[PDB]
Amino acid sequence: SHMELTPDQQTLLHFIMDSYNKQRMPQEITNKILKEAFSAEENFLILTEMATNHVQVLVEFTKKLPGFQTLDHEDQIALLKGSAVEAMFLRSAEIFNKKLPSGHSDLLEARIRNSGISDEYITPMFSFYKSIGELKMTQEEYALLTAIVILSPDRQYIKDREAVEKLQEPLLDVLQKLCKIHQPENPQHFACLLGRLTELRTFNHHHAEMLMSWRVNDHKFTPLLCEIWDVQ
Amino acid sequence: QLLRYLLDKD
Ligand SMILES: O=C(NC1CCCCC1)[C@H]([C@@H]1CCCCO1)n1c(-c2ccc(Cl)cc2)nc2cc(F)c(Cl)cc21
């Protein structure tokens, strides 16, 4: 015997990785944080521009998820709308923790704190980012956790939850096996990853409150954001 | 709508 994924699991992981790694110009966000104007308007513009590009990326990643096309079309839209917020926060946590130039963390925080976001929501946002950082996550972990977040059968209303469970279970199984292969000295690693998914769910309520605040302060969103975030 | 288009395209 051995500790390896079976050939079908290696294949499934390969297409999740090929899809996840499809990132046009990853230096762009890094340079925007470092070089753009430091105004409340520019900071908000980075967020809507990055969040819009991310939704496009998320739909392309989602539609290629193993078995996603076997799903009822209303449940497909509900999974995408129900997971968009968590996926954005998980993706932000990934970029936050990447090897970035000196001062990037300080400049990014200076921007987040000048984006019309209340202090009440910045605290759990930074706490989550730091907890993600402590786990020292691989690209495989970020890609699989994102797929698991999208294919969640227990968050929002879904007509056929069993159909969604059946697509999520092999992803959870590939992820647990990768923790046994890549972190064998830490048997509680998988449970820590699942702990982070529990923490991710708190951002649904946080984001709903941030959106209400932005709308009150006459903030504009792109048609694609208005649709996925259900803005009126 | 936009999401349906992005989901059903190609
Ligand atoms: O553009 C952002 N995130 C995108 C979203 C799509 C996926 C890629 C990352 C924002 C912007 C950055 C400029 C100041 C305002 O927040 N941002 C947030 C964030 C702010 C509020 C909400 Cl409601 C959610 C996320 N956390 C971030 C962590 C980071 F490391 C970086 Cl670089 C940017 C981050």
From TrEMBL, chain B:
It is found in: Nucleus. The chain holds residues 747 to 756 of 1399 of the full protein. Coiled coil: none annotated. It comes from Homo sapiens (Human). It comes from the Eukaryota. Nuclear receptor coactivator that directly binds nuclear receptors and stimulates the transcriptional activities in a hormone-dependent fashion. Involved in the coactivation of different nuclear receptors, such as for steroids (PGR, GR and ER), retinoids (RXRs), thyroid hormone (TRs) and prostanoids (PPARs). Also involved in coactivation mediated by STAT3, STAT5A, STAT5B and STAT6 transcription factors. Displays histone acetyltransferase activity toward H3 and H4; the relevance of such activity remains however unclear. Signal peptide: none annotated. This is Nuclear receptor coactivator. Belongs to the SRC/p160 nuclear receptor coactivator family.
